[PDB]
Amino acid sequence: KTTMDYITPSFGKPKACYVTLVRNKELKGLLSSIKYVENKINKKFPYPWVFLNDEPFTEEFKEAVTKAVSSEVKFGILPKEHWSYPEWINQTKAAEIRADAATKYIYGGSESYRHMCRYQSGFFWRHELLEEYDWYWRVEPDIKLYCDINYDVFKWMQENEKVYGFTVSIHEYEVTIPTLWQTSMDFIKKNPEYLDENNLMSFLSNDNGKTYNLCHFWSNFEIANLNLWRSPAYREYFDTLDHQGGFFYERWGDAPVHSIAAALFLPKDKIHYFSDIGYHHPPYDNCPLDKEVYNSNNCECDQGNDFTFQGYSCGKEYYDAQGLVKPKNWKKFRE
């Protein structure tokens, strides 16, 4: 029973939800995101919205969010076990790494940020509020949906048998994940059955797996099948990363973690790029380059700032790996 075997069953309305991990003090930026989701798709195809916080939500936060969302909303606090140091982690060591990296890279000195990355990597998908669902669409605060979305995306994913959907890709700052690749490759050598014969390795590596090109999918935007994270393959991959310690001794983000897994554990035709969904998560945009799609969906983004084909993005690498025909003027973005 392979990884896909755990996913194909979920292939009449799909069981799905939007999911948001957020802080009380980010209310204004969250309300702005909700307004975008509501006007661009949620009024048309309603799905419940799950809100998660490592601390309890204030009544002010809940009242404002409940009022702003038109479909059903659910608020949850996450378990102490999913947001706290594991017994095998040396906290004094973790504290020194933080202090030393405070000014070295973004969130380098942040204690809470690392707990968040670990949370998004191995726990959000098994929070009690997501168990009844098969699909989720992650939404962060201060986001923009630049265009109308006129079809149910979960329905679409379900009918087309897609597992992982994304919009923005990029090269990770390596100082942030020094030993992530080595750790992941050792896992695969130990568990060859988990490496799909038709995987997307070429997106992650230019040398047949020897080294990592640092490419990954942005995690702030994800529309995916929860059964992937719930598979033995992913569960065992996360546990290996957890025990190695990178989430705390380095600054492993959930994005490169979700990406390496999706790209290695699945037949590559299970991964999908929503070239049609206009989106912004500071500081980058995914703006539809197809004029018909851009105009029919009343996109509000400047096509000229689409990040997809810019050098530091991994859109080119993704297109070549999938054998997708890149848009006519894709090279302009490398100027």
Ligand X SMILES: *[C@@H]1O[C@H](CO)[C@@H](O[C@H]2O[C@H](CO)[C@@H](O[C@@H]3O[C@H](CO[C@H]4O[C@H](CO[C@H]5O[C@H](CO)[C@@H](O)[C@H](O)[C@@H]5O)[C@@H](O)[C@H](O[C@H]5O[C@H](CO)[C@@H](O)[C@H](O)[C@@H]5O)[C@@H]4O)[C@@H](O)[C@H](O[C@H]4O[C@H](CO)[C@@H](O)[C@H](O)[C@@H]4O[C@H]4O[C@H](CO)[C@@H](O)[C@H](O)[C@@H]4O)[C@@H]3O)[C@H](O)[C@H]2NC(C)=O)[C@H](O)[C@H]1NC(C)=O
Ligand Y SMILES: Nc1nc2c(ncn2[C@@H]2O[C@H](COP(=O)(O)OP(=O)(O)O)[C@@H](O)[C@H]2O)c(=O)[nH]1
Ligand Z SMILES: *[C@@H]1O[C@H](CO)[C@@H](O[C@H]2O[C@H](CO)[C@@H](O)[C@H](O)[C@H]2NC(C)=O)[C@H](O)[C@H]1NC(C)=O
Q: Contacts with Mn ion in 97-116 (CB under 5 A)? A: none
Amino acid at 46: P
Question: Do 310 and 170 form a contact (C-beta atoms < 8 A)?
Answer: no
**From residue 151 to residue 170, what is the string marking binding to a copy of itself with x (rule CB under 8 A)?**
--------------------
Which of Mn ion, ligand Z, Cl ion, none interacts with 140 (beta carbon under 5 to 8 A by kind)? Mn ion
Q: How many residues bind Mn ion (CB under 5 A)?
A: 2
Distance in Å, CB of 289 to Mn ion, minimum: 21
90 contributes a contact to ligand Z by CB under 6 A: yes
Q: How does strand 279-281 pair with strand 144-145?
A: antiparallel
Rounded to the nearest whole angstrom, what is the least distance from the CB of residue 94 to ligand Z in the complex? Answer: 8
Q: What is the CB neighbour count within 10 angstroms for residue 46? A: 14
| Residue 94-133 contact track with Cl ion, rule CB under 5 A, x = bound | -------------x--------------------------
- Which contacts (CB < 8 Å, 24+ apart) does range 283-292 have? 284/168, 284/170, 284/218, 284/313, 285/146, 285/168, 286/167, 286/168, 286/221, 287/146, 288/147, 289/327, 289/329, 289/330, 290/327
Which CB, 106 or 324, lies closer to ligand Y? 106
- Give the C-alpha separation, 215 to 259, whole Å: 8
In the bound complex, what is the minimum distance in angstroms from residue 249's beta carbon to ligand X?
A: 10
User: CB-wise, 39 or 91, nearer to ligand Z?
Assistant: 91
Residue 50 burial (CB < 10 Å; 0-12/13-18/19+)? buried
According to the binding rule CB under 6 A, does residue 116 interact with ligand Y? yes
Among 134, 140, 196, 276, binds Mn ion (CB under 5 A): 140
Active site residue 236: no
Q: How far apart are CA 271 and CA 231, in angstroms?
A: 16
Q: Could you say which residues in the range 25-64 bind ligand Y, by CB under 6 A? A: 26, 53-54
107 binds a copy of itself (CB under 8 A): yes
Q: Is 208 in the site for a copy of itself (CB under 8 A)?
A: no
> Is residue 96 within the footprint of ligand Z (CB under 6 A)?
yes
Q: Name the region of 139 (left: φ>0; alpha: ψ -120 to 50; beta: rest).
A: beta
Active-site residue, selected from the candidate residues 222, 236, 250, 300: 222
Site string for ligand Y, 140-169 (x = CB under 6 A): xx----------------------------
Quick one: which segment of 21-29, 187-195, 272-280, 312-320 binds ligand Y (CB under 6 A)?
Answer: 21-29
CB count within 10 Å of CB 128 equals 9
The pairing of beta strand 284-286 with beta strand 271-273: unpaired
Torsion, Cα of 31, 34, 39, 44 (10° steps): -150
Q: What gap in Å lies between CA 178 and CA 156, rounded to an integer? A: 37
Query: Given CA atoms 284, 323, 276, 41 in this order, what sign does their dihedral have?
Result: negative
Using CB distances below 5 to 8 A depending on partner kind, what does residue 84 bind out of Cl ion, a copy of itself, ligand X, none? Cl ion
The catalytic residue positions are: 222
Query: Which stretches of the chain bind Mn ion, using CB under 5 A?
Result: 140, 220
Query: Which stretches of the chain bind ligand Y, using CB under 6 A?
Result: 20-23, 26, 53-54, 112-113, 116, 140-141, 220
